[PDB]
Amino acid sequence: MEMEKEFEQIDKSGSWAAIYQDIRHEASDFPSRVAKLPKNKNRNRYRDVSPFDHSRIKLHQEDNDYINASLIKMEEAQRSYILTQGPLPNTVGHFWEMVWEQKSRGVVMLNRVMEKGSLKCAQYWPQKEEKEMIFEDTNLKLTLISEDIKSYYTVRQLELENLTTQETREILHFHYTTWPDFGVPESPASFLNFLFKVRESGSLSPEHGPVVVHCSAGIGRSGTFCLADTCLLLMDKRKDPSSVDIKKVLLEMRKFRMGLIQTADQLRFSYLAVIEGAKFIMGD
Numbered sequence: 484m485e486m487e488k489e490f491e492q493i494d495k496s497g498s499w500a501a502i503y504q505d506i507r508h509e510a511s512d513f514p515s516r517v518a519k520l521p522k523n524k525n526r527n528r529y530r531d532v533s534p535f536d537h538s539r540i541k542l543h544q545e546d547n548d549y550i551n552a553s554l555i556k557m558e559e560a561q562r563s564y565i566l567t568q569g570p571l572p573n574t575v576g577h578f579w580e581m582v583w584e585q586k587s588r589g590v591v592m593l594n595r596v597m598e599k600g601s602l603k604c605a606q607y608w609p610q611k612e613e614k615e616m617i618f619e620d621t622n623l624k625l626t627l628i629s630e631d632i633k634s635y636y637t638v639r640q641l642e643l644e645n646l647t648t649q650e651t652r653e654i655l656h657f658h659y660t661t662w663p664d665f666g667v668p669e670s671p672a673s674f675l676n677f678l679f680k681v682r683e684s685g686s687l688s689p690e691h692g693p694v695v696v697h698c699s700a701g702i703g704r705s706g707t708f709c710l711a712d713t714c715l716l717l718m719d720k721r722k723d724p725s726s727v728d729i730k731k732v733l734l735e736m737r738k739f740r741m742g743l744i745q746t747a748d749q750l751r752f753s754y755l756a757v758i759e760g761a762k763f764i765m766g767d
């Protein structure tokens with residue numbers, strides 16, 4: 484069923500809450516035993532948001548290999564994503580260790596450091612060229628190279644140095660700065676523009692490790708980003724773009740991380756983004 488017609492049928496009937504609860508009921512439940520070990524309590528931002536054991540990213544160290552991060556592997560679309568929480572004061576070094584070890588080119592940030600008057604993640608990148616950051620626990624150095632501030636997003640060029648080997652890599656930081664403190668954006672136009680800027684950079688391409696995507700918990704806004712990207716890629720590959728079922732793609736992604744899409748309003752916004760996405764790239 485063409486999703487644009489499914490959309491108007493749900494809107495006219497006002498059944499968004501009913502559709503959303505059906506997804507919550509059918510979603511996978513897999514063990515997260517490593518996340519719940521007592522040694523890992525200060526590595527989790529939220530007690531109710533944990534990576535599954537089968538899909539968690541492992542840090543390359545013998546001490547403690549745990550980080551709140553999941554590998555989302557989309558077999559038909561041929562895309563992979565790492566979805567993670569906003570870094571905590573004691574996990575900023577783990578975060579950059581993961582970017583290094585997984586060979587990621589891009590980090591996608593969908594939150595502000597402060598929202599609703601409370602801290603939603605650590606200040607984990609340098610704000611001035613001449614004041615670099617050193618992470619002594621993981622032996623990494625991070626330097627701000629350049630910053631491009633636009634109305635709806637900022638892009639940063641960062642240099643990550645493995646102090647152990649003196650190898651360096653260029654990381655691109657894509658910061659979506661205008662998601663509202665409450666609800667979802669009225670139009671998906673600026674979110675879509677942002678998504679196609681991340682693509683144009685190479686950060687989502689198979690010649691690099693998976694993109695790292697985060698918000699505060701790494702399930703709601705983060706879920707919206709990967710769901711829109713994968714659905715638009717499937718519409719480009721298939722003989723019948725009308726066969727793409729957004730609810731079935733979301734349930735496949737929920738095999739790899741719990742809770743993706745946190746509200747019925749985020750589910751409706753994801754439909755709106757894909758639908759408009761299709762028109763721009765398939766109509767005109």
Ligand SMILES: Cc1ccc2c(c1)[C@@H]1[C@H](CO2)CN2C(=O)CCN12
Nearest residue numbers: 675676679680759760761762763764
């Ligand atoms: C669906 C959509 C919306 C916006 C948008 C794109 C796609 C992106 C980039 C422009 O922003 C450039 N681009 C094209 O010219 C073809 C499509 N793709």
